[PDB]
Enzyme design. Sequence first.
Site, short mmCIF file in Angstrom:
data_model
loop_
_atom_site.label_atom_id
_atom_site.label_comp_id
_atom_site.label_asym_id
_atom_site.label_seq_id
_atom_site.Cartn_x
_atom_site.Cartn_y
_atom_site.Cartn_z
N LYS A 1 -1.09 4.51 -10.81
CA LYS A 1 -0.61 5.40 -9.55
C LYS A 1 0.83 5.29 -9.68
O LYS A 1 1.97 5.38 -8.62
CB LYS A 1 -1.65 4.82 -7.81
CG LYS A 1 -2.71 5.41 -7.50
CD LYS A 1 -3.53 4.31 -7.55
CE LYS A 1 -4.76 5.03 -6.81
NZ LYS A 1 -5.74 4.67 -6.07
N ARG B 1 -2.22 0.17 -6.40
CA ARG B 1 -3.70 -0.35 -6.81
C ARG B 1 -3.60 -1.08 -8.19
O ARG B 1 -3.88 -1.53 -9.05
CB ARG B 1 -4.91 0.36 -6.79
CG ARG B 1 -4.85 -0.06 -5.16
CD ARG B 1 -6.31 -0.30 -4.97
NE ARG B 1 -7.17 0.01 -3.51
CZ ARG B 1 -8.24 -0.84 -3.40
NH1 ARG B 1 -9.09 -1.56 -3.87
NH2 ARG B 1 -8.83 -0.25 -1.13
N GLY C 1 0.76 -1.34 0.19
CA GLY C 1 0.13 0.07 0.24
C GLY C 1 0.91 1.11 0.09
O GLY C 1 0.60 2.12 0.98
N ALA C 2 1.96 1.54 -0.69
CA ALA C 2 2.98 2.23 -1.01
C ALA C 2 2.35 3.56 -1.46
O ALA C 2 3.43 4.37 -1.54
CB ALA C 2 4.13 1.71 -2.26
N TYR D 1 -13.47 0.58 11.68
CA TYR D 1 -12.67 0.27 11.49
C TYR D 1 -11.14 0.10 12.64
O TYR D 1 -11.05 -0.35 12.46
CB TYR D 1 -11.99 1.88 10.75
CG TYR D 1 -10.68 2.15 10.80
CD1 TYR D 1 -9.90 1.99 9.81
CD2 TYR D 1 -10.15 3.22 11.44
CE1 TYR D 1 -8.59 2.15 9.47
CE2 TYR D 1 -8.73 3.18 11.67
CZ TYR D 1 -7.96 3.30 10.75
OH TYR D 1 -6.43 3.19 10.77
N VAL E 1 -2.70 10.52 12.97
CA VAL E 1 -1.41 10.28 12.00
C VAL E 1 -1.48 12.17 11.32
O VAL E 1 -2.40 12.24 10.58
CB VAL E 1 -0.89 9.73 11.08
CG1 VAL E 1 0.81 10.12 10.50
CG2 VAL E 1 -0.72 7.89 12.14
N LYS F 1 -9.41 -2.52 11.98
CA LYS F 1 -7.20 -3.16 12.60
C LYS F 1 -7.09 -4.15 13.68
O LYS F 1 -5.92 -4.82 13.47
CB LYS F 1 -7.13 -1.83 12.94
CG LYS F 1 -7.75 -0.70 11.80
CD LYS F 1 -6.79 -0.63 11.19
CE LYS F 1 -4.55 -0.47 11.44
NZ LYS F 1 -4.39 -1.13 10.02
N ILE G 1 -6.41 -6.21 -2.17
CA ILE G 1 -5.32 -7.22 -0.15
C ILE G 1 -6.79 -8.45 -0.41
O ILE G 1 -5.71 -9.45 -0.07
CB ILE G 1 -5.35 -6.29 0.16
CG1 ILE G 1 -5.95 -5.07 1.03
CG2 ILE G 1 -4.14 -5.11 -0.21
CD1 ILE G 1 -5.35 -4.41 1.86
N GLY H 1 -0.48 5.44 -0.23
CA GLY H 1 -0.54 6.34 0.78
C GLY H 1 -0.19 7.05 1.58
O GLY H 1 1.34 7.55 1.59
N1 NAP Z 1 -4.34 8.48 11.46
C1 NAP Z 1 -3.71 7.29 10.41
O1 NAP Z 1 -4.14 8.60 9.28
C2 NAP Z 1 -3.56 6.22 10.85
C3 NAP Z 1 -3.66 5.72 11.70
C4 NAP Z 1 -3.26 4.17 12.87
C5 NAP Z 1 -3.32 3.44 11.69
N2 NAP Z 1 -3.66 3.87 10.19
C6 NAP Z 1 -2.80 2.78 8.23
O2 NAP Z 1 -1.65 3.21 8.46
C7 NAP Z 1 -2.12 2.85 7.44
C8 NAP Z 1 -1.80 4.09 5.88
O3 NAP Z 1 -3.09 5.00 6.61
P1 NAP Z 1 -3.05 6.43 5.65
O4 NAP Z 1 -3.06 7.28 7.07
O5 NAP Z 1 -1.87 5.82 5.38
O6 NAP Z 1 -4.22 6.21 4.91
P2 NAP Z 1 -4.41 6.39 3.10
O7 NAP Z 1 -3.20 7.34 2.78
O8 NAP Z 1 -5.56 6.08 3.16
O9 NAP Z 1 -3.45 4.65 3.06
C9 NAP Z 1 -4.20 3.85 2.58
C10 NAP Z 1 -2.96 2.63 1.53
O10 NAP Z 1 -3.69 1.08 1.68
C11 NAP Z 1 -4.09 1.17 0.38
N3 NAP Z 1 -5.26 0.46 0.86
C12 NAP Z 1 -6.79 0.44 1.55
N4 NAP Z 1 -7.01 -0.84 1.12
C13 NAP Z 1 -6.42 -1.70 0.18
C14 NAP Z 1 -7.00 -2.62 -0.93
N5 NAP Z 1 -8.62 -3.08 0.04
N6 NAP Z 1 -6.21 -3.31 -1.08
C15 NAP Z 1 -5.23 -2.45 -2.11
N7 NAP Z 1 -4.59 -1.09 -1.55
C16 NAP Z 1 -5.62 -0.67 -0.33
C17 NAP Z 1 -4.32 2.73 -0.61
O11 NAP Z 1 -4.63 2.05 -1.84
P3 NAP Z 1 -5.14 3.06 -2.35
O12 NAP Z 1 -5.50 4.53 -2.09
O13 NAP Z 1 -5.98 2.80 -3.78
O14 NAP Z 1 -7.34 2.79 -2.09
C18 NAP Z 1 -3.19 2.98 0.34
O15 NAP Z 1 -2.45 3.23 -0.23
C19 NAP Z 1 -2.95 1.82 7.78
O16 NAP Z 1 -3.02 0.80 7.06
C20 NAP Z 1 -3.72 2.19 8.17
O17 NAP Z 1 -4.63 1.56 8.99
C21 NAP Z 1 -3.31 5.18 9.94
#
Ligand code: NAP
Length: 342
Positions: free
Chosen positions: A36, A32, A7-8, A164, A198, A168, A57, A10
């Site tokens: 991208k 995906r 998921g690189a 959500y 974050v 997790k 995924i 995001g």
């Molecule tokens: N406050 C926060 O931001 C926070 C806090 C705790 C944990 N996290 C975790 O950090 C990680 C990244 O979060 P983020 O804030 O960076 O949000 P994000 O920018 O939306 O990134 C999510 C990443 O995972 C990909 N993804 C999600 N569902 C997918 C699926 N079914 N199949 C393939 N790819 C998928 C997304 O790709 P696409 O965009 O192309 O779908 C994206 O690359 C996540 O695991 C999140 O649970 C985030």
Amino acid sequence: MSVLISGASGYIAKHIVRVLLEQNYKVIGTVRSQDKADKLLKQYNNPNLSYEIVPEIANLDAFDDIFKKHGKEIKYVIHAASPVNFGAKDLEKDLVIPAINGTKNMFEAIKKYAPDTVERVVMTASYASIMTPHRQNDPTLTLDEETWNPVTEENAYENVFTAYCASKTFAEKEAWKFVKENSDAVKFKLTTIHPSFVFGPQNFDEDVTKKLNVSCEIINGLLHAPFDTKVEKTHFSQFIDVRDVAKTHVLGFQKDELINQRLLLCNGAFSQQDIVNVFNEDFPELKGQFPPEDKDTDLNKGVTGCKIDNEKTKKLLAFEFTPFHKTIHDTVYQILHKEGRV
Ligand SMILES: NC(=O)c1ccc[n+]([C@@H]2O[C@H](COP(=O)([O-])OP(=O)(O)OC[C@H]3O[C@@H](n4cnc5c(N)ncnc54)[C@H](OP(=O)(O)O)[C@@H]3O)[C@@H](O)[C@H]2O)c1
């Protein structure tokens, strides 16, 4: 010894990839679409970076092709892909299933194709798999690295947020269960990272768009809210800076003391108003273009909600976390500067 990161594309992952490239790692990112991948490759412009396409995924053996191709060269895996955007009325199919299945898929792919090659897996869990959502405001609850969100499948879907957080939690449960059930079969050691909300700049200025990723959209929407908007001054949650999150992931596969650790990344309580106060303090010449300053917040009354005991995490990581005021400042500055306002 390449690094694979799930998921690189995001928000957090782009920082992780930046740190990996700063340290001269060879990086294989999962995205995906070729769409991208192409944009990302042009943004980093680094020959150590490549992308493979994983459209979904949740789908059957989603990560098997990557390890059939690069299994001999991948030494470290960062499993960061999990749904953060999703249909509010497709909570199973858009959220819980891909969270769990993406984790099983990644771990089973390693077991099938690189059981003696992959040395470490660092998994992005969340503060959400440690905390109890409806007790964020309860100062009698103390959270530490061994605490678990007690949400069950039955009560997981109370609302979009509990769902959500359950996504997790259930995904992380499966990861540790896999690790305990395959100790002798697979060689990798697991480390989970647990960020709270974050905040911080997008890794690239061009990614400051009209709507940001969910966590930073909190800041972005407050920054563009009409001056008269009602801003909540009650304790909301804990934050952590994205640059600390990225740094922590990379340490996570380097440092032997982080093996089998759940790392709890929080560095301060906040309300929406505490964020808004940074706008007014740090950019006073823009006063009136966003909601006003108000020092009457829970935080300023000694009210920070559930207790965060992450002393073990902080000792293990040894580097000092970025403070709230700076994290908010850098987020805001990047937006305002991108808009030509400062
Ligand atoms: N406050 C926060 O931001 C926070 C806090 C705790 C944990 N996290 C975790 O950090 C990680 C990244 O979060 P983020 O804030 O960076 O949000 P994000 O920018 O939306 O990134 C999510 C990443 O995972 C990909 N993804 C999600 N569902 C997918 C699926 N079914 N199949 C393939 N790819 C998928 C997304 O790709 P696409 O965009 O192309 O779908 C994206 O690359 C996540 O695991 C999140 O649970 C985030």
